[PDB]
């Protein structure tokens, strides 16, 4: 059940006070959709190519926790490289 | 035929500020104008800033072992990159006084993702007079190469203001906005 969402939301709240572990500059875009199964719906971090993200910690194999380096942007779930690749694969399969 | 991979690059947690222009580092006109700007940052961002000299050739940063063709070794450069990353780790503003960098293309293929600040004298005639009132050709050529860069994509900030105080306030405003983006509520 959606006890899972509650735990995910708790980990996110706990990370608000954690330091930035590392930063990345993106080479691709991510435009979040409901169907990406984000640990807490509504909390995915979308971004464009060449955006900067501050990453705090790993949530699971599909999702990190961090924020877009942009005024007013808050902590949420960032897709891992594994998750980005699986979305790219899924899209290329369905477009074929 | 017709001339048409990791999703994330790891970069410093605060993008290092690098100054380029008006001409070549190592010569008086550029060294004095950049020194005034560094001086200003040290006191405007006191307690929030680290300004550090980098002498190693960080343009060199990215089965025969790759080695540098100059006095700056790839191992020394890697050590300096690591030091820059560490400086940025706690989210202080990092400013680099990077001797070897005079053109933004020099850092384009590195992992540093700098904030490139173009200190610009928009009129070449003005630059020529400044220099001669204090090697001319290499300086003019350098300033002209900067003037040829597509400005929006090459530079993060362009300081073309005649009055030092106006250039300083422009730089400060940009860095204050970056401070806010990164913190949710010559030397
Ligand atoms: Cl799809």
From Swiss-Prot, chain B:
Source species, domain of life: Eukaryota
Tissue spec: Highly expressed in heart and brain, and at lower levels in lung.
Subcellular location field: Cell membrane, Sarcolemma
Subunit: Component of a calcium channel complex consisting of a pore-forming alpha subunit (CACNA1S) and the ancillary subunits CACNB1 or CACNB2, CACNG1 and CACNA2D1. The channel complex contains alpha, beta, gamma and delta subunits in a 1:1:1:1 ratio, i.e. it contains either CACNB1 or CACNB2. Interacts with CACNA1C. Interacts with RRAD; interaction may be involved in beta-adrenergic regulation of heart rate and contractile force. Interaction with RRAD regulates the trafficking of CACNA1C to the cell membrane. Interacts with TMIGD2. Interacts with CAMK2D. Interacts with CBARP. Interacts with CAMK2A.
Task of the protein: Beta subunit of voltage-dependent calcium channels which contributes to the function of the calcium channel by increasing peak calcium current. Plays a role in shifting voltage dependencies of activation and inactivation of the channel. May modulate G protein inhibition. May contribute to beta-adrenergic augmentation of Ca(2+) influx in cardiomyocytes, thereby regulating increases in heart rate and contractile force. Involved in membrane targeting of the alpha-1 subunit CACNA1C.
Similarity comment: Belongs to the calcium channel beta subunit family.
This protein's name: Voltage-dependent L-type calcium channel subunit beta-2
Phylogenetic classification of the source organism: Eukaryota, Metazoa, Chordata, Craniata, Vertebrata
